[model samples]
Target: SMSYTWTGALITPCAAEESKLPINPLSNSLLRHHNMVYATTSRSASLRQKKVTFDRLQVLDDHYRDVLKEMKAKASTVKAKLLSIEEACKLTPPHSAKSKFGYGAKDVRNLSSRAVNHIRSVWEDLLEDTETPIDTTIMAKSEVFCVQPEKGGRKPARLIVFPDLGVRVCEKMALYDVVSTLPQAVMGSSYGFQYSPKQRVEFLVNTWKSKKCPMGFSYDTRCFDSTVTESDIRVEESIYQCCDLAPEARQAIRSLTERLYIGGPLTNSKGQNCGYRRCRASGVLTTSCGNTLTCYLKATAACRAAKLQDCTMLVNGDDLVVICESAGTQEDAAALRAFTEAMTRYSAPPGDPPQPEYDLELITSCSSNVSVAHDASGKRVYYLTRDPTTPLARAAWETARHTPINSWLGNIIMYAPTLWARMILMTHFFSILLAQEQLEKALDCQIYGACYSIEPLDLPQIIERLHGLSAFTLHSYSPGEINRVASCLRKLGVPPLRTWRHRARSVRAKLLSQGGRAATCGRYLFNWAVRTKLKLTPIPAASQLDLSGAFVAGYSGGDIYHSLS
Candidate 1:
């Protein structure tokens, strides 16, 4: 089936979109080459459409069925409950799009009579119409990136197709419990969204060590969401159906699967008939879980087809990393080819060919890899790290524009143990926040799709809680990690690591003078800055932090809000 059937109508932008990063003193201070940092806009949507729209051919065999059965057996042991209208409404983010039906996210959260009534109506409509396709607004996501010279300069914008605000609430009411619980129940440790950054690194390290001769590789599925077939989505639905669910919940799930999940009509910002999507909707409640199940099924089967032994996979949506016992270099290479062929036959083709890496540090998954660093006591610690080109680019954009979601803060929180995020991102962004005197301001950022309004001053405690005190005192990063950061700095026209170190010292002094949480932030977070660092002790407030909704699931477009009110 065709992934999409587009109309003559263009994907019109609702407002004027900026492609080039704006030239501002703050942004310029971080990245000199503002021209090199570009944001994808609707102008490039057509190009992206051409790349993603294609016919899919899938050939499933006994191996795929076997995996499905195993997943279902695990899924059957679980039970899911229907979320109340109020429960679902509270989950909606403050910035979520207001409904055309005279209600906003705030109204929904407050359980305004109109909002509750509309939600119930949407739920009733879901139960009534199982055949009519749901309407989804299609928009080009404006995400920042550094220009890749080899990738033809700037890449096109990604399309996000999502149902209206009310239906979104209905989606949560129907499938929220299932998505949050089922993936972890079935896939266990392999379900990547279930792990924190610290846990993820530990899992990767342990998995690598468990193998006698480990060969690891991360798989890149070429537009995995677009490659999703109706059959695949149905298969995902069947898996969900295996879970014992409330009667109304079951009905709503079945109806949503038929009407929205399998395929939907796309409308642009102008409400024009943009197209029809028969593939995965990037912005849906089930997207992450659906992709995880489908990807895991195909990859597990593919591994068997390739005869890869003792394969341990870490899957986050479509992102997959496999660590397995190495057969010889030539045999491993050939086996990966066979695996790729099987995945291609299953309609999840690779964007880039996979190559086996003998070293654990070399295998990057979810844009992160395991890297070694030393703590205050000089004990080796494995931590997650990624190239900083994109993070830095986005941070520069956020500095000038001050967007609602502060990804830099989130990076500082999640990747605090990493050398790049700690030395560069922490120093750079904290310095800016300190200069602006907004250290006390709570800025929203996502940990795993769940929105968190974190205060900059509280970062010391947050880091200690999520990572550890060791994160504040980590030093002597591996040369491979250091080299990557240095290379990325040079590429993005950012100042060298030494320049950041010098700047951190000044920032550290400023933070220390504030006295209180700010002083704690400086003393702990910027410990790497001073030669004679203060002895890092356990943060008293870190223990008090209630980190319940932080790493529960991936809510990329689910409009989830776990406001720390």
Candidate 2:
């Protein structure tokens, strides 16, 4: 009975009443919809009250204490491990065998453990420093700067000023001293009287006094002066006086002084430009003393917008007359002058014919002469004659001879200078012969020995004829007849001297086979055969020698007999 009828369905009384109930009056939706209609409005102000706070105080305190406890436990463990390893190494007996593996077996392990322990000690020291402030004071004052190693040597000498404390601390820890002492301590022994604390302090002072401050302050306002100069008592005293200030005040003074004396944020000299002699000596460039690209861009834009008149140039007729500014140095002035001259030349009307293009003919000529040669024996020789008929046939003959010779000779002709020269000369002659087409008839006449009664007019041509004659002899004769014909040709002066000499040598060998030395008259006859065959004049030998007392080296009695024979 509590349900109400809506159309054909019945609705529960609870559900109907719940739907009709009003929204909460304190709700964000209700407040927002009432005043702030714009959806883009920030809701941060409304949400700020409910924002979560990061309460790290408890976490940090617990974290720090835990770190300290862990570090101390780790340090103790490392120290014990190092000591054990060190004792093990020291107690190990030496081996007699130099190469035995057991020799110094624990040394490596001991050294590694010590290194790890050193790292652990360093970490522990850092942790302790975090737990407490470091105690640093100006132990001494000096004008000289002492060099120190950065690592295993002396500490690099640096002039550190505590503006608040008004004290300058010099880094003067000597590397040699530290290294020499460290080994002794590591070996569980003191350096005895060799270590002098007073001497060390004195060295530090002397180093400080010897060193020059690359950077200095000009005023109490913190103007850092990079210029090198003698130490000022007043400046030093003022810096010391300011040391009593709070850390923040001291830092502020240093910052102000650095900015004033050095430059602004974008214009401070650093690295190479930092006025330290070490920086300059090391060849560093100060890049910090310059405006940034963004600043430069802004400045350039400002300058352009100001419409500043440049009094550099005025109009002269159609050209512009300009006074160039020099950058003081001769090199700079010269460069400027060259640039101006180039620019002026560019502005002027281009004159006359642009100088004629340089010829590369000389260079071409220098690179053009290379050639080759080969043995011309045992082959047919063809001569392309200078005639009007049979041009194609002549070309075919020349080509057949050349192609086969080039292929069979293994290109050895490239190495023979005489043959190469002949080929080059023949090439020019052949070119003319090819153009005239007169080679066929002339070649035929030459081959038959009809062109020359006494000898061919050209000696080189006659030599070529002899080559052809030799080929003819080979073609017409049997093996025995070929030798006879060759011998006959040799007497006719139709071959080169070397070719004839080769033939004579061959004949002499044949004569020796008949079981006797060839007579001296026979040798003379062979020589005459060679001269006639090669178309060369013969020279007579002056005399013969039969020296007996001449002692020979590197020969046995049998070798001497063989040579004489």
Candidate 3:
């Protein structure tokens, strides 16, 4: 394999300890607490080699068929249009990772015709290989680091290589919705992101409270997508066979899977070929969709075979959580071990053997921790949190490009009540967004580079769904959470929550004076500043669909959020 070249602007190479010293305050706090980890695979990782799981045997009952029918119906309603090469190139972010083709992202967005032509040519070449297989450039570049706890001066950068610009547009045309909605339909509540952190915690808590065997735990796939063997990729294709896709749509999907989804060759930044991938590539259009469906399929059967009673799984990408009745401390542990074995045979590897969690809320999926914290009121509060490392890293990036960390706005909306999210993260990024005149701009963000187009106005619905109508009245920073927040804020070079409160007053007055969605944002997001606020209102995005869905997902920026309902 080629050594990873850290090309992205997010971080420096790991061993540059001298230069990386005095690391960002947020990083320092997280490092001190051991709260964050690198998400990428390491050098000695094993590729999952297993016998083929997706044969002619599929166990779809009424629920599966019905979901497929519904998804196909929705997919049919979509009429995805392809962009002209120039138009696609224009959508590329001004700061996107530069192409190895020697043009920077700015040059591409600036309408370099040569870049456009190269993109078009790349698409044309890919379109020719529908009947056979092809390869693509896979390189290790610095990927976004988050807080899950590990040594992270620089872990391995991510493996990325997928469609060129023109093909990205084509992917949006044919497969975006298929991937976004299909898993939700088939997996139902078990589909990741269908449940909010609040809902997920509530469900786990309720399940634990309700059971004698109350056991809950999450499963981690070791290099999940990379471990996706050639047979598994084809099995993923077979899962799609159940859906009724239009002919062109089906062809486009198969073409993409053959060329990009299955492992392709790796190329270094200097243009040296490293090796080929015979597994799933992270950057392909269908990686998340493919993993979700494949894991769900394997898991559903594994559960049945394990015969674990009354088990419900929430699988987001490769991250999975299983909450079920405890067979007993001894019994549950054995059940978990048995469950792990069956799932392992199916290509998903457990990061550790599943351990029974009597304290169920401690189990995590999606990097979020659901636990209790003491508030300023000296009362205990429960909320969702990962570590602040990623959010802080995000802030540091904004200070560089001076981009407002637009995505952090949505994070505030989703994680508003989480102790760290509210006091530290909210104080910091909102300050940046407020200063940048970004409050009104529909800035870009994502659910892990998956989707976006979120603005402050859209947050009311998200909050209502995730936090309930009382989000307006629910702004207490637990003392411990607040302590962490204050320490983090001091370390991270940001103003205090008190300063944010002051800013909120001014923003609120201006917002209420301005009215409409602006007023809504101020009231909902900044509501801690005002009392007796107006009732939460619905966003126009729900009523109007064609322009964009409430949560839209697609290949490129500006409306890439990729979820509906």
Candidate 4:
């Protein structure tokens, strides 16, 4: 005990005092001394015989990857072809000339045939294996410039032919191609072509020359007879004159023709968003059970994180209602309910609280009516309206309603106006009525109409009558009723003046508002002119005095002025 006690030290306990203790230098370090020791030991042992775990880095599938590679190659080829064709069209002179000719009034029909054929071939090849159908109908071939044989053949023999430059690039192209044919033929005189209207008239007159002698006259006297006879009949020739064809005129025509072929602004009708079939393809926010729930849950979590108060979960009949002072909070609850409801409801018994299903109507209504509220707390509280008729409700409804079935129906409705107008113009009124009946049978909707009385001569009365008829038919009939209305209108000699006027007004407003940015105003003007011409009623004038009036005046013995006695 005497020698060992000094080596171990004294063991007497004393009172605790405040004193600086030796700081642990390695206390702050993430790695402990023991961990380093273990790692060094494992590293040394593993180097001798390394083992690989193949299960961790295994391959699963390569089919999709290979397919992607193939698609990439095919896409590249198509892109190259499109680029080359665009460049060739721009650079080549003959192609350019042909394009110009295609738009000319004289050559538009022929050119359209060529363009359509080319487009058809391209489309067929491009979609060779695809199941989708392609529409290849080209525009109408009626050119702007048409030759009208003068009445009585008394007008000038020569006529200056002008190219009908359409408003849009496509329409202009149609006009230019046809008109260009004339100049081309004229320039190519070696091909027995001439531009002289007088020459053409002279030729026509000579072709119709008479050989018969006059009545009561011998063949020898027929030649000397001045009076009208079968053999001595005067040859009335209808000649188209082409004289003093100004360089500026030709140049303007050519320039416009070139512009048409090369392409210019699209017509307003073409560019309008109202009737586009592909608009649905663009990704827009829509309602979905999965997304609604997910978003709602996310929103809820965010609200909780932000320390939002005054939140309440309510229940309506057959609905789990989330009542929160803020719309954001409400949305969060709604999303969670939508997400968890299905799983929770189906997994449990029928009598249990129904699992939350996405209510598109509710979501839409809430989102659309989002607003902020403030109380004595001086904190902003977001609130959403409970009404389902609001824009938000509609939007939410649309999300779910944008399925293929609804989309197809929407497209049909979108294109209906134009198609209806066309059919009414082309079909009979009775046929339209039958068609409407058929549609009503299919749609299970009631339709009815009644005739009204009004003076046909009065413009306002006519308009009112038409309006009433249209409204009655529209309310009572299906789309098929158009055929009947069209047939009836045609039979009654009631021109589609109203339809034309409406279309003209619509086109004019669109063009003027758009500042010719995307649409061609020229086509609208042309259509207006055509419609006006078709509906134009001759106004009563002194020159065209009604013979019936003169007869009545004479019969009544009242100041009869000019009588055909």
Name the 10 consecutive residues with the lowest summed lDDT in model 4.
Answer: 231-240
lDDT per residue, candidate 2, 361-472, as tens digits? 1111001111111122445221211111112122222332221111111111111112211222222222333335432322211110001111111222223222322211
lDDT of predicted model 4: 0.22
Q: Which has the greatest TM-score?
A: 1
lDDT of 4 by residue, 193-271 (tens): 1212222222222222321210010001110111111111100000001212333323323332223211122111122
Candidate 2 regions off by >4 Å?
Answer: 1-120, 127-132, 144-565
* RMSD of each candidate relative to the true structure: 1.2, 48.4, 7.5, 40.9
lDDT of 3 by residue, 1-565 (tens): 1112223222222221111223454444223322232333323111111221121212334433443344445334434343355544544555555565677656766768766676656566555667544444544343344433343444444445554444554565566656656666566667655555566667656666776656788887666665566666776765565566766666667777777666555554345564555666666667777777677666666676576888887776777788887676777777877777766766566666666776655676777756664433445556676656566555444433334235466577667766555444544545455656676666666644544456655666666666655554555544555676676655544566666666666766666666776666666666666555555555554453332333322222221333321
Indicate the TM-score of model 1: 0.98
Model 2 compared with the native: what TM-score?
Answer: 0.11
Give per-residue lDDT, candidate 1, residue 249. 93
Per-model TM-score, in order, reads 0.98, 0.11, 0.71, 0.14
Q: Which stretches of candidate 1 lie above 4 Å from their native place?
A: none
Point out the higher-scoring one by lDDT: 1 or 4. Answer: 1
**Model 3, TM vs. native:** 0.71
TM-score, prediction 4: 0.14
Pick by TM-score: 3 or 4, better one: 3
